[PDB]
Symmetry: D2
Subunit: 247 residues, 4 copies
Amino acid sequence: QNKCALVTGSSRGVGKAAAIRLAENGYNIVINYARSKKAALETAEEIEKLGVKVLVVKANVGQPAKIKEMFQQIDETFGRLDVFVNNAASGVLRPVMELEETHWDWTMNINAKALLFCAQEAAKLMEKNGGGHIVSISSLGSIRYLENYTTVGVSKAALEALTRYLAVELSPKQIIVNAVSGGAIFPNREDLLEDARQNTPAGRMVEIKDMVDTVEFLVSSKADMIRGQTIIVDGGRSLLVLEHHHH
Amino acid sequence: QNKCALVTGSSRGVGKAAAIRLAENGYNIVINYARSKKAALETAEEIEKLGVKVLVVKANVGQPAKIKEMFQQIDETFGRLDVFVNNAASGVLRPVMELEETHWDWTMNINAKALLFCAQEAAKLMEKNGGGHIVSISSLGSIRYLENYTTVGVSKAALEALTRYLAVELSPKQIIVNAVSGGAIFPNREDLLEDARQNTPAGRMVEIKDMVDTVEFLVSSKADMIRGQTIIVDGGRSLLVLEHHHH
Amino acid sequence: NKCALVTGSSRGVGKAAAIRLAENGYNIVINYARSKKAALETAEEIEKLGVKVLVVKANVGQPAKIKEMFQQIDETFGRLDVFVNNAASGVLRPVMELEETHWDWTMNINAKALLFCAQEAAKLMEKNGGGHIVSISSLGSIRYLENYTTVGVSKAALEALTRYLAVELSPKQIIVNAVSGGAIDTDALKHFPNREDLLEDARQNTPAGRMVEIKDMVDTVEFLVSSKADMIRGQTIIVDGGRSLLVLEHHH
Amino acid sequence: NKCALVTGSSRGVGKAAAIRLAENGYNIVINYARSKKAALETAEEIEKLGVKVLVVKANVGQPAKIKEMFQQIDETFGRLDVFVNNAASGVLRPVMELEETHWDWTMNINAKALLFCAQEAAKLMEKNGGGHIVSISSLGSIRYLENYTTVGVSKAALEALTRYLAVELSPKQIIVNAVSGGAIDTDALKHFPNREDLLEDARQNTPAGRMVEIKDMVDTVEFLVSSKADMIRGQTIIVDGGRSLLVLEHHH
């Protein structure tokens, strides 16, 4: 019977919408959450009400043996994995390491490493059932806290370089690797949103479903020949420095 | 009633499949051909047998006033253009300029210029009906002849740079610009194909429909937030130098 | 004598670039954001090298003040031959309210500042047959200080703006390149009480012999502005000992 | 004395790079594909500079012969400090039959050759504490000659292979960069009966003062291998006066 999809950081936000969409396409879903059993089980229930089996597993970026154990559970629950959505667009916070204080590159390095570690672990299981697909997604939401707590997101360059690297490592195992970078958009909640609305060309505010569509495309059998590509989905917001200058 | 799509180089190969797919999605189609009225009108007839109106117009890369005239015809036939498939993956040949003999960059320069000239002309018409979409496609098929006759294709770098440039110029007119580069694959016909088959990982030979899918994705309303992106569709063939080395 | 402007040049990489260019025989414009004395000290050290020097105050997000500084260079030296467009200074700027929502907005404001300065410089350089612009950038110390952020730009944004400038300005005989060389992560240039414990942490995580220093970013800037580099256009060089891809090397 | 290998060095850019490195005090290995005499003449000119020289014959698509050349360098000089991995020589190679089907296959064979040489060089450099590798490339004269093609690689392929090498070899103290500088389009280096009419055509289509020459690619190679560039890793520099984006400048 059904194919299996793991989505990390999927008790809410983009992870949830991605796991929902995939449940609607008939995958059995693995929901992964870092603290917040509540949202996670709510989300599992929703999923379950479409037919489709669900498994809920807890683990966060800073937990290597818990991550391996999570894949060991997937194997014992479903015995296969087809689609892995390696989500660093979740806005989940992780403690700042002293290192990172010295340079932004160290954050990117730690976060790219986490993306790579997860994708490789996933690959050991996928290659039992003849491979499958990995799509890494990422957004650099905010910097609310820095007292510990920074993003798990990577920049587009690090994402590009990491996903080019994975496609060459994993194409020989029948794992199709791509990525999507962008990310949609505390107090003043409304005021920060109106600030962001007036600074964006009309009609060009990215939403969660926009990132979800692309992942869905990449994971359908209409994209099996796209390898190691990183697609920016953001309505052009990362190059707005050029539109305004070029007029 | 219907939306309108122009596909250049569409009397055969990838152009044809792209114009077919779009006819199946309910666009009125403009077929453009360079010499070979036969294939073109055959192709128009096929199109017409799906409902959907067709217009056949002749013009080639080396003909500026004929190209403008072609858009002046579209305007007088349909009075609007929504989707433009700026096709440099057609394998149509153009005469070599003496310039090009001196360096590959001059070929790329001439061909990128042609892509840009067409896209800008198209943009003047599209902006009458509130914009639309442009997808530039390209492949560097062979070098059969060089006695005149070279490709109209561009490299991925020139395609990237040209499509980044167009998205910033045209996003302010509601024209969504992206690109796809790759291209599927005379005597020994069979032997060159078996050579290409044994040198490609099994299951990873790109076909025309693979480029057609991506264009179709980019042109659906599921991609309106993808701007100025160039997607490589080739099963990883352009980075096979790395798979073989990295083992 | 030729003339060189270097923004954020009272301290750090901009200081060291102004010294190297003064050593090559340019008159120098020192731009400072914050402390007069540092800028006055640097001005005096470069004067000891036998070039004239001009100190002007201006910070990003002061477009009127920026415009006047270039009017001052024209008033004082009447020319501009090299512009080191410095976003690698570690200077902090006030956070704009939108930019709380997404990293992209910070990158957009920072890139727009580099663009605007280079364009202002270019109007001036027109009058003496053009020159060289090099934008340099580091995303160093995104430490903490609610309401303060980096003026730095990321590689991708630096690359795209440098491509753009070179295409816009080569026709005006202005050679445009950039150094992202993520910049100097070493360096007592970093005001953390633990200053020392952090350097040794940076040192213990980076392969031996591979810690970039200010002088490496400066050596590239100097090569880009020497006669030996005139056919390089619109390039962005990362100078960081591979730090930004250490992840791939760990992986292998 | 240190030692430098430059492939395709009998003529053109490889010749000029061997001369510059001999002028900096390296012993030189001249590799030639085709003509003994050119290589013998170049060897004699570099000898006049007071360094020792070794001439070895080898062409791409001869992997056994390539391996032996590095064994010869070890036999003659016992070390290797700088490898100029030259795909900008304009040397032609026999077309493989698959590569008729798509440009990508030519780029794959050309990139694989650069990779294989640099890896062979690296085994040797291990024994003297590593060194510098710079790959250079030009897609010049893709003229005509049924059954013959360029050994050159495109920017994107050069960039991806250089990224790869730097990640693989930095851990071995081998600094890897590349110059694509699309190379020299000028140049009596180009054997067309109309030689002259073609240069003036190249000249009339490129902005004034913006025609790259061999010495510009050589100046970058020399900067990349000097002490001043050790923190630059895995970078690919285009040196072409903007030629590869002239399309954007026309457009504007």
